[PDB]
Amino acid sequence: MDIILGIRVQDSVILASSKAVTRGISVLKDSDDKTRQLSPHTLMSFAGEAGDTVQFAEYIQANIQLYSIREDYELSPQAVSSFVRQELAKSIRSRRPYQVNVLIGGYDKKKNKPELYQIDYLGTKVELPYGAHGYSGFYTFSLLDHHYRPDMTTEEGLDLLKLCVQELEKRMPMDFKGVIVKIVDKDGIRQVDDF
């Protein structure tokens, strides 16, 4: 767990998440998918304390899937993000808090708009055009400030994202073994296999 990014463009949300899983002085895995599909048009990436991340992600996933079945209806990204924030907001004052930071990328079918939410382990939610957790932001944010435009296409977003990954690969101390990129749009969630 380390690098998770997010870019909201004109018609989609793009999430990029590092593939490395490091424990001690060994990279145990270099093909780890740090994300869960909460609903057909909602994707959540995650990074933080080992174990907590997946345990939290799957717990949220289960809850949203339970809601979907009960109401035969998909919750809006805004609604899901609020539910997630509240769970973390409870967690922080628990005996043992979830130390997990998440990005929630979703496409609102009622508004026909992509939406990116950044929530940290304290339960601090913000809607953004582009977001990141951990040290990733320190490099990418300034790069995105410069190159990002709100009317970009998905293809323009992927090029902008490549520019971020290249910068991270140049200046980051740790080898994060590239990223898995996923796109969330009107047609749902799909993975870019060649990045």
Partner: peptide, 8 residues
């Protein structure tokens, strides 16, 4: 780190 991103 912010300045590096624009420079590089």
């Amino acid at each position: 780190t912010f300045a590096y991103g624009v420079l590089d």
